[PDB]
Design a binder for this molecule. Structure first.
Ligand code: DTP
Length: 319
């Protein structure tokens, strides 16, 4: 017996029997290119291993309210529109702020929005839109808001089953295949407090599952500026999972580009961080992540070069 060789034949038949990524090495480096939709976050893009959200797949983005999950979904939509794609938004929360969405670069006017009367209707409409192959991405707001018609139409405490999770199951079962044929990325948003009853099946049907969470409150000096989010890619059937990313989302703003640059530039050594002060190729950036953010904001030439440097090192800029 020659373990490594017996192992390859094993993993080969596993992937062949159940698909690419059925089993992989955490430390491997996937060259499977696969057509993604940039998450609007460079670090998150890298964490996913393929530059963004894989297309034709089910993506789940769960986490507590106000942790950044809609922002990622919106940024995702925007990048898909910019690349000439058509976007759909199955809304059952009635929270969306098109004004904020435009700010993140979304073309709201061309955005399809549906506000379904029940969970069945919601999924059914999404399934119908998907099968026209016209969409590049479709976002479903609130897995939890997908309450069965039976529950909606007031019905007795009798015959009360875990119908919502069944609903989400059958729905995901038939939709996933279409999503594959269509190549449409379907982001399910799980604002959670079973993962909201329906997140049960979503756990098995997703090719990617992002754990969005808010960790810090960007204070800059000593006042509210934005908030730092951390996303853990808990499931990734297209790359080695378990990676992590972090990013700033200033108030009323989307994911900070400069913020990302300052973070990855530091860790990747392109930008030196002496305690308190930041420097790049011997240029002074400022004393304070925020001053540095401002600096990079104003000196668009720097940052663009830093982005280049950081980009080059790890694949390249998104689409
Ligand atoms: N309408 C808005 N006005 C100002 N800032 C906003 C707005 N929407 C989002 N943001 C910014 C600041 C928020 O602290 C940050 C995170 O909120 P959001 O992305 O909605 O979190 P979330 O997606 O985890 O919540 P949920 O998914 O429950 O809606 O995004």
């Amino acid at each position: 017996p020659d373990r490594e060789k017996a192992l390859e034949l094993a993993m080969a038949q596993i992937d062949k029997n159940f698909g690419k990524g059925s089993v992989m090495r955490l430390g491997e480096e996937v060259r499977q290119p696969i057509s993604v939709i940039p998450t609007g976050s460079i670090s998150l893009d890298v964490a996913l291993g393929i530059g963004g959200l894989p297309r034709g797949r089910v993506i789940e983005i769960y986490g507590p309210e106000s942790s950044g999950k809609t922002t990622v979904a919106l940024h995702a939509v925007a990048n898909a529109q910019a690349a000439g794609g058509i976007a759909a938004f199955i809304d059952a929360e009635h929270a969306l702020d098109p004004e904020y969405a435009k700010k993140l670069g979304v073309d709201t006017d061309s955005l399809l929005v549906s506000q379904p009367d029940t969970g069945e209707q919601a999924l059914e409409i999404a399934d119908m839109l998907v099968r026209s192959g016209a969409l590049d991405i479709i976002v479903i707001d609130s897995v939890a808001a997908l309450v069965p018609r039976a529950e909606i139409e007031g019905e007795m405490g009798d015959s009360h089953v875990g119908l919502q999770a069944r609903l989400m199951s059958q729905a995901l079962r038939k939709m996933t295949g279409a999503l594959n044929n269509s190549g449409t990325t379907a982001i399910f948003i799980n604002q959670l407090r079973e993962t909201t009853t329906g997140g049960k099946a979503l756990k098995f049907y997703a090719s990617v599952r992002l754990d969005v969470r808010r960790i810090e409150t960007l204070k800059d000096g000593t006042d509210a500026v934005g908030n730092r989010t951390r996303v853990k890619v808990v499931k990734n059937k297209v790359s080695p999972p378990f990676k992590q990313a972090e990013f700033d989302i200033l108030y009323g703003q989307g994911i900070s580009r400069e913020g990302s640059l300052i973070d990855m530039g530091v860790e990747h050594g392109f930008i030196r961080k002496s305690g308190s002060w930041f420097t790049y190729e011997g240029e002074q950036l400022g004393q304070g992540k925020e001053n540095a953010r401002k600096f990079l904001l104003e000196n668009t030439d720097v940052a663009n070069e830093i982005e280049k440097k950081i980009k080059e090192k790890l694949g390249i800029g998104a689409v």
